[PDB]
Symmetry: C4
Subunit: 335 residues, 4 copies
């Protein structure tokens, strides 16, 4: 295969560090402040131990599932990551092409270096969603939703954990965004604006960035269709729990009323299994996709997605699960 | 800005290590004995995880609060640190000037390299308090209180955790204070002397150095106006808990009868948020102020205070808090 | 003695790393994926603390016990490890000869580089068992059992945790087995095939690879004679618990109906004591045997087994135990 | 003072490593096997946190206490360490002279490089006890007790955790004792031999090496006068708990019927405070005494003892304790 030989997600990061300008690599890697939550997003997955069932017959595995009523090849989807064209010339076009190939969904950043329309045209058969920021300018906010609707996108992920940008130390050091966001994004965002957004579109809406059970229930009350349990990849408020650690309480709080997803520190097939065992319908990957792009554009993303798929297929088979329906809560226990 | 580029409190320490004579840097940095509590003052903050509320509207933040009935710009104040003129020529004059600029309070060491009067004259509009040791000589002890009263200081912080000085290994190695304190400070100090001090002055009095809930309640009983939960920056008895870990029990013990403050290991805006979520009215910083002074005197202190302010403003906004009144206990949970 | 001087199991590994080609050493050492469980198999033993009884009279120790009704010199036996002829020319013949000398049992891999018959002929007086994989080809599966029966083997250990091979990163890097196993081993294996196997042979059957209490009880229900609590030396599903940590729950689940064994991270006499105190009849060693072989073939295996025996004899005597019958559960408590 | 400048117990060890032949340093330093308990004897003290009382009046401290009815200057005494003449020419004579100077007790090894009589003559006013092994030869065992009685020793510490010597890896590597002990010490030792010993002498008898509450109570039943909670400095059975962690359960089990002491990992004044807060009458130091000897014979031991005394005096004063009677259990809580 392609050289150098990369066989797990960490290899992709290690490769990306070797080829990317420091300030770009740093921008992608960084967490907020002392990066306590960034270390924890990963370490937390390790604390959840797996309890595999044997002798279940795993000759045939079917990794397919559904996200907000749309079928996907696997419970592993591409999360929004700004400015993908810094990692590769093809940026978000490469990403959507790979998602089309794999049969999974792509969440498009509002801060994409490719337009809603262009992404639809590169991947017309891909499952596509828009990640939306509520800008101070509600007119452009509305325009984005309408372009998403018109261009055949299938949900809006409204990010609710970024009234201001987090403080990522390397970005400041590298004189690299916090000021631009403060100029553009509306920090006044409340549940009122979520009601506005719910009236504006009939598309499925997911609140991205929920970490509390009470906010989750509030999301349900406002007719939202899903919760993405996210600490924004540990890039916003540092010292928040790992997403894997809060997921079960969010899942409990929501009472099956709404689909619950996770992102933050997914690197391996076992991370995927553990999230699903805890009640997540699907997970999203942020950084691994950028590492994929940095390695080989479309094929790199495809590689990263296929590593995650097959790692997940194996962990599923080793744990006695033929498909996602048979993943249950007795599969996991925290140490 | 000023070079080298320092953007968080740790940078200031790293700079101070590079420019200060070893024995001075060491004197400032050191904890007691094996520095177990010194590591814990910091590590403990990391264990307390934040549970941010989303969609609260944080377009306007007001960090102002009040300490012992006096208004301050932020719940972040300067704690007493002896011999500031070793870090910078302007020492405590630079410090009070910065506190005046920021609108926060300065706690003046009894072991200041500037007099009560001089500090009042450098920062006549600054909120100023005296940190008092009860010397064997009660006449000078009384003189200090009377000078503080006459010079427009607004409280006495009586330090109660230093009957003798702790054993800081580097100070001994560097042949650098323990003997001088044993000659000067009265180890016979009991609750009787606190009753004396309470009769001596009508100024607000805070017991600094309380780590036990029973002592806290005893402080309330003696008509004291506040508790500063402090292990003296881990420089007295090593192996005492981190201040953040004992705060909630002190807060509980006191039953809202008296204001409770914290110092010890505050380095970040999130440390400030976490202390307030646990019931502290305000925090004090010791070392970061000395690092500030070592970098650029007044402006350095101002920089350190402004880093803490804005870090705190951000952590507040990211956690859904517009002001300090809405900080509550559901914001935190220990891991 | 023989040089270099090796006096504990870790020395043997350190020696084997120095003399074996990297890809062979790596093949032997590796765990699955990030090797979380591989670190835990060992670290977990360290968390279980010993509570030795004094003054019991340990002048005479008898380490003998019985496995599936057959007497052994010690509760320490050789687990199946594929392709031993990579470590030494004599491979499995050297291993069985050493087991014969020591009076303990050898578990023979289905993937041995020596035949069932040859191993019987090298060690005709050795206690010998067959580790069986259920191949897609049930005819060869049956042939192996029949050769084991005919050649005087005394049990079948059916491995139930390998429907597919785990992903061992170094093997992939070194272009070293996963594909060959997927071609050969039947992933469709269920409890039905265990019923088949139970009808096929009157030999004692042990399910190897059980990690769950419910599977353990299911094993009992199917007339199996033992459980080998195993995570396949952390080489299958990564993130499963250490075997020492799940043993007590398996032991409880089984209600003394069946003998329970452990493998995974046994390196020391105290590991052996701790497993027995938790309810294991006997332990199996995988890697230490390969390290032994790499050092000096038969004598190396003999050395490793004798280190384990005597380490175990000492830990037994120091803990007040004259024989295995007096090992009890009050001997251990987890920290 | 004397050079190099050593100001805490760790400095003494660091000095001893620099001047002692490796095999001698190693012999002294080593724990058993992987030295898990050796690390834990120390780390465990760190987990017990101190809760100092303020404002108690600590102008006068009295560190004096009593051990088995005999007064000592401090609750810090010298434990038995074999072959002290390897660290210094004066060996046990230097040690007893220092104990005489300080007014504390010396526990003399049965494996001393100085005789019972000679030690009595070097330190005729020192508080002296004999550490006794029950040799296979009961005639010499009895002779030692009778010489101790005749020479004015005031207790027998019978070591009950060494039926065989532990396996200390460096000793084996360095070809350095296990065989000699197996030839000399009786592994058949039971409670019967303790009854024998109790009939043999009217001297106070302490069982040294108890780690279990049931053995402790058995010790009480046999008319023993004290328990020394000891894991033999982590040199016997590895993986036993730290002595500080089991002390409170031993203390509880004994119901104040008998005095309870601790050794194992005492390096600091706070270690002493923490042991007493948990119920120990006194602690014993092993290794620090050998480090003292290696530095400067008698004066070195004196220095180490005085460091421990004054460290303890300070920790006592900082925690609000004027004497040992006022040390209580609310002073400590495990983290
Ligand atoms: C380089 C980068 C850029 C990101 N840009 C966005 C964005 O534009 N919009 C958004 O909602 N989240 C953004 N996020 C957060 C991700 O959507 C997601 O929550 C996070 O990457 C998932 O964690 P993981 O990277 O550890 O997979 C970004 C994250 C990274 C790492
Ligand atoms: C260099 C230094 C000097 C100090 N001098 C005093 C003092 O004179 N009086 C006093 O009450 N506390 C003194 N303290 C303790 C501080 O008031 C405070 O409790 C501690 O610095 C806060 O912890 P932090 O440094 O980790 O912020 C000193 C602390 C340091 C680090
Ligand atoms: C190099 C190696 C080869 C192995 N081959 C087999 C095998 O052929 N069949 C099997 O059931 N288990 C196999 N195992 C797993 C072992 O039977 C056993 O569960 C594991 O080695 C015990 O753990 P330890 O190595 O840490 O002792 C193998 C393990 C290793 C390390
Ligand atoms: C070098 C050395 C020699 C020892 N020799 C004896 C001995 O002869 N008899 C005995 O009962 N204990 C012996 N011990 C154990 C000590 O009495 C004691 O339990 C241990 O040293 C205390 O732990 P610490 O060294 O960490 O202080 C020895 C310990 C060491 C470190
Ligand atoms: C091709 C024209 C450029 C399109 C506009 C892109 C501007 C993006 C600058 C603002 C920085 C966003 S960084 C961000 N937003 N949300 N999450 C993140 C993150 O870095 O985690
Ligand atoms: C300008 C004339 C000098 C004024 C007197 C200063 C003497 C200070 C020497 C005593 C050392 C105090 S160090 C201290 N006190 N309290 N806390 C500390 C600390 O180092 O934490
Ligand atoms: C002498 C002729 C060769 C006999 C057939 C040996 C083929 C073995 C190749 C398959 C790789 C097995 S590796 C394995 N199986 N079970 N556990 C393991 C392991 O590596 O843990
Ligand atoms: C001057 C003549 C020599 C007197 C006899 C000394 C012999 C000692 C050799 C046996 C080794 C004892 S080491 C030991 N015993 N108990 N605890 C220990 C230890 O090393 O912890």
């Amino acid at each position: 295969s392609m050289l150098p030989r990369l066989i797990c997600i960490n290899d992709y990061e290690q490769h990306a560090k070797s080829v990317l300008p420091k300030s770009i690599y740093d921008y992608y890697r960084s967490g907020a402040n002392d990066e306590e939550t960034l270390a924890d997003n990963i370490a937390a997955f390790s604390r959840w131990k797996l309890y595999p069932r044997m002798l279940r017959n795993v000759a045939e595995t079917d990794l397919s599932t559904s996200v907000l009523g749309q079928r996907v090849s696997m419970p592993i989807c591409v999360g929004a990551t700004a400015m993908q064209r810094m990692a590769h010339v093809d940026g978000e076009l490469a990403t959507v092409r790979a998602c089309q190939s794999l049969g999974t969904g792509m969440m498009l950043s509002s801060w994409a270096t490719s337009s809603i329309e262009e992404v639809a045209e590169a991947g017309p058969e891909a499952l596509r969603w828009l990640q939306l920021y509520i800008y101070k300018d509600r007119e452009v906010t509305k325009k984005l939703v309408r372009q998403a609707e018109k261009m055949g996108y299938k949900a809006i992920f409204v990010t609710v954990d970024t009234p201001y940008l987090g403080n990522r130390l390397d970005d400041v050091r590298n004189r690299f965004l916090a000021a631009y966001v403060a100029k553009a994004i509306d920090p006044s965002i409340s549940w009122e604006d979520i009601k506005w957004l719910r009236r504006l579109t009939s598309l499925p809406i997911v609140a991205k960035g929920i970490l509390r059970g009470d906010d989750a229930r509030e999301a349900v009350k406002h007719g939202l269709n899903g919760i993405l349990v996210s600490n924004h990849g540990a890039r916003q408020l540092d010292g928040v729990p790992a997403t894997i650690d809060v997921l079960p309480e969010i899942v409990e709080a929501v009472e099956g009323k709404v689909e619950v997803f996770l992102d933050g520190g997914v690197r391996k097939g076992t991370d995927v299994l553990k999230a699903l065992a805890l009640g997540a319908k699907a997970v999203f990957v942020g950084r691994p996709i950028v590492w994929g792009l940095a390695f080989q554009g479309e094929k790199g993303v495809q590689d990263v997605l296929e590593i995650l798929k097959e790692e997940f297929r194996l962990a599923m088979a080793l744990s006695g699960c033929q498909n996602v329906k048979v993943i249950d809560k007795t599969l996991v226990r925290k140490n």
